[PDB]
Amino acid sequence: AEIYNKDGNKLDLYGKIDGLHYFSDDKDVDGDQTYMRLGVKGETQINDQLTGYGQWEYNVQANNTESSSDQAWTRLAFAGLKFGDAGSFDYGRNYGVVYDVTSWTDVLPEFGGDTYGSDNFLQSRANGVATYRNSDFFGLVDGLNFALQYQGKNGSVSGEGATNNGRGALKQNGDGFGTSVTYDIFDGISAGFAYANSKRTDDQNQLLLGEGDHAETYTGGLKYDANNIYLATQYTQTYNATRAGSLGFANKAQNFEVAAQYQFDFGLRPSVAYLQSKGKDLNGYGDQDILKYVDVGATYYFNKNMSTYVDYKINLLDDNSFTRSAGISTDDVVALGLVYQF
Amino acid sequence: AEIYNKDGNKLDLYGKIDGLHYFSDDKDVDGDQTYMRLGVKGETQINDQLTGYGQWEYNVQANNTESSSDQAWTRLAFAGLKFGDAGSFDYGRNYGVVYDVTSWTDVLPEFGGDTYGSDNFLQSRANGVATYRNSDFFGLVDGLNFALQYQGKNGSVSGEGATNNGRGALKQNGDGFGTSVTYDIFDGISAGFAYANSKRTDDQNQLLLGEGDHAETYTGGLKYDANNIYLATQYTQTYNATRAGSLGFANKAQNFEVAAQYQFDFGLRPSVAYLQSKGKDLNGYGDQDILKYVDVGATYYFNKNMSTYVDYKINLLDDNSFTRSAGISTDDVVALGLVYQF
Amino acid sequence: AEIYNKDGNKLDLYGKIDGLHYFSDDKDVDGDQTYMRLGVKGETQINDQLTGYGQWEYNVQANNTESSSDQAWTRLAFAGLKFGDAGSFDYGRNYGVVYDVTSWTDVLPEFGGDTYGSDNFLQSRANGVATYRNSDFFGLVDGLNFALQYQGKNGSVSGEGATNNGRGALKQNGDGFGTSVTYDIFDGISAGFAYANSKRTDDQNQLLLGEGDHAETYTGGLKYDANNIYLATQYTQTYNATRAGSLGFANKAQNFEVAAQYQFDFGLRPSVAYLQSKGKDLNGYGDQDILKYVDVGATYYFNKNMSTYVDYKINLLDDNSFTRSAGISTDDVVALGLVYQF
Numbered sequence A, B, C: 001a002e003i004y005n006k007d008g009n010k011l012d013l014y015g016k017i018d019g020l021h022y023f024s025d026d027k028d029v030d031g032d033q034t035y036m037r038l039g040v041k042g043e044t045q046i047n048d049q050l051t052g053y054g055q056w057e058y059n060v061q062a063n064n065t066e067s068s069s070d071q072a073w074t075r076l077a078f079a080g081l082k083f084g085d086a087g088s089f090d091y092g093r094n095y096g097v098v099y100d101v102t103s104w105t106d107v108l109p110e111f112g113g114d115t116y117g118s119d120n121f122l123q124s125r126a127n128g129v130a131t132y133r134n135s136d137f138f139g140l141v142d143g144l145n146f147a148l149q150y151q152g153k154n155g156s157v158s159g160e161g162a163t164n165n166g167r168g169a170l171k172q173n174g175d176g177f178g179t180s181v182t183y184d185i186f187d188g189i190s191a192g193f194a195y196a197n198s199k200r201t202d203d204q205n206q207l208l209l210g211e212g213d214h215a216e217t218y219t220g221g222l223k224y225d226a227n228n229i230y231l232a233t234q235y236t237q238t239y240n241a242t243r244a245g246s247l248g249f250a251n252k253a254q255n256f257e258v259a260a261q262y263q264f265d266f267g268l269r270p271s272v273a274y275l276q277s278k279g280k281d282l283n284g285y286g287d288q289d290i291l292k293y294v295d296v297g298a299t300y301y302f303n304k305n306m307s308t309y310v311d312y313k314i315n316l317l318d319d320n321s322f323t324r325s326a327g328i329s330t331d332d333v334v335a336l337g338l339v340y341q342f
């Protein structure tokens, strides 16, 4: 909601209040899930070419008691400059360039978008990331955009890995970089490829699974969007990058996602999708499946401010020594929600 | 404060900044008490009959250091639909229907409203609560309203009680339901009754006091409001529902509250009230008093945005083995405050 | 940004999003430093003479993971009344009157302002502080202002020191008071003096260094501001008030700060400053330096909403047994930032 516009400067106070409930045999996901988001977006005019911006986004959980702890966190926070034609530059806590392509399939009612995690190198939201983007290849080629980003090291809490912003091994990282490229081929058809590479840290190599100096990703995608039809698919291959439960990293893995949906003029929007993550050579566990399920659900829009939804996750995983040790869930889940947004 | 209204949608950013100070011989309540609340309220027009809404409210303490922890929590968070005549429906973190009646006496300057607590079954604010309300009995009877709500189970943090939203025994609960009914008899005279009942959990029965399968409440109230006079009283009887300090639950107890106040045209609003909670059969402690005091204070309004107040709690409890073991306070308290609200 | 003004009441929603990065050999300060501030300011008209106000300010860090803890805190929170001529009165979490003078030198791009800390008696931000201020000596003398404040005791977490708002020894305090006086001599020349005195607590005297019943400060300052020139200096002498690393308090110490800067009409604002804190009689460590460095940097303004900066701290301290035991840093630091504010 735009709440201020005057003298070259403008503001946006936005967010949502989601009433969620989960139904599952898995006791650590079953129950109330209500939460809420709050955010701010700014834009200031400097010249006829230069223009500054900034954005912050917060997540506040509302399913526990008034005495509970660690209930809220920050998802995004950054500042940048926009140069009209030559592109844009920003820095802070933001999305890794890999998401530029993998977001094409992150469009389910509740689930989905989980063959990666956050603070997982440059695959999703991350700390201290400098980003440069260019739009229609300067004004020349239409619909051809690309980006280049660098991320500094986020070490341990003490010892030598250490950096002021210390976290645990599964969320650490060394210096790295990545780039993406997308193109609008013709009518509602787009294609894209993105690559990333970064240094691993000492603590990471002293973990149960995974061994290497570098962490890498190669990802390509395709998408169709027109005439109330949405069709998208993504494929990505990783080397010492995707987490294997709580045990460590997969030496090599292959991820695949597919989504399809239709938009009825009267509000209903049914959806069907499928996804899986397969790991190879897991230090004595051989070849295992890390994630695998079929999702079926639908969402109803009252208007651009209110909606309801139902989502149904059908788990295809088999209970075994691996899933048990890694802490990976194998049960089904059903979500039901009511949400208001401004 | 309404900060946005345009195209069928409207917003409210509200709250307050309270400068509080407590004077007491009880060392764990004596001292600075400054805090602040922030909230948001929305409303979107859908049809000539349908209309969606949402509300969030946060509490942020300001009496400790910039390095202290667990200083802020969420009080309310929910979304609903309003059907014009047929009523309304909402879900999330909200008030239990019992408060529909007991709030009649929760009108003191600082103290009062404490024969119950929060996250105490359906007596005050609680997690994951679905609520349906109907206004003038459809349009037919004027001033006759009622409500019906259901609350899902909020288990332990692990083991089998467990649910994703795990908390400790004194704040757990099983599936339950409750209803309330209020009626405007004539000139500034209202009456109301509310009943609730819910399942208890394993962990709750392994506590020092209290034993049972169900937790129940029966509450009735009366109120007079007109000609600058305010008179209200509430009576409620519980079974395995009211907490007995930190030891467990009272097998049966009786709660009573009375408040009276006058509003001078020039701003001053003096107040006098009295309340007590009496417990029966406390597993070897017999019959004891759980709470008991007389309150006298007054508040001054500069306008609808600023005010000052003083409150004086006169504790009638006697120091003994019970109050000592349960952790119940027996000293007096004096509050003094300055508050600004928007 | 003023987002509401109507019917005698007005609101301000303000803040900033700062993209920061530190470069240092000191591993506990090196790395990402991104954070963000959010605040609210209100003002309500009561009479032709009376007028109420309120302010809150929050700090939210954005350089760690979505699972990290203790990432946000409250800096200010208070309410007051303004009496037109006779002055003003407010209470809550606010600045100590000593800052009225020492702020004259707290104007560096990133560093500086550190010969004191927060929750350090009445030298910076503190809990439960009642403040009275008077402007032009009632309307009589122009540019001559003064203030008088009292701060209640902030004890320990338990035992007898205890108060509801319990914190650790280095941040405790007893009852105290302080006053300041400033005067505008002539053209862009001001001078000021401020004094404070408060009782120490038991826990504070059982610390490794420092011994006394009272904590005191005597501070005087001078400033020149005109024709794009800024010149300021501050001197203050303490008795059992300035912290000596993590070991305790200095029995007596002397602090000195100097800053100088020039404002080019086209946006650039270079700056040079120097500061040091010298401690005397440190229970067997003799006379030591507690802080000492030279700072050189500059900031560029795109407009009243966007800016960039670089800051360079040149540490003059020598590595020794003292600095090592107290936990005092001896390396250099370089900051680089991009910031948007509203």
Ligand SMILES: CCCCCCCCCCCC
Binding pocket: B181, B183, B191, B192
């Ligand atoms: C058997 C019908 C029961 C009807 C109960 C109506 C409750 C109205 C309460 C009015 C209190 C003054």
Ligand SMILES: CCCCCCCCCCCC
Binding pocket: B185, B191
């Ligand atoms: C006009 C006064 C109406 C008060 C209603 C009292 C109802 C008492 C019900 C007792 C049920 C046990």
Ligand SMILES: CCCCCCCCCCCC
Binding pocket: B181, B191, B192, B193, B220, B221, B222, B233, B234, B235
């Ligand atoms: C549904 C209406 C029930 C009316 C019961 C009135 C009981 C009043 C008791 C007041 C106790 C302080």
Ligand SMILES: CCCCCCCCCCCC
Binding pocket: B220, B235
């Ligand atoms: C006009 C007030 C009528 C009060 C009626 C009271 C009915 C019995 C209430 C019993 C409460 C324990």
Ligand SMILES: CCCCCCCCCCCC
Binding pocket: B222, B233, B235
């Ligand atoms: C005219 C005032 C009527 C007040 C009624 C109080 C009812 C108290 C009920 C106590 C039941 C044990």
Ligand SMILES: CCCCCCCCCCCC
Binding pocket: B231, B233, B256, B258
């Ligand atoms: C208007 C005030 C009504 C007061 C009714 C007295 C009820 C006393 C209840 C005592 C419960 C043990």
Ligand SMILES: CCCCCCCCCCCC
Binding pocket: B258, B259, B260, B272, B273, B274, B294, B316
């Ligand atoms: C409604 C307020 C009445 C206050 C009367 C106080 C009487 C104190 C009696 C104490 C008995 C233990």
Ligand SMILES: CCCCCCCCCCCC
Binding pocket: B258, B274
């Ligand atoms: C206006 C006078 C109201 C009197 C109400 C008396 C209630 C006293 C309660 C004492 C319980 C022991």
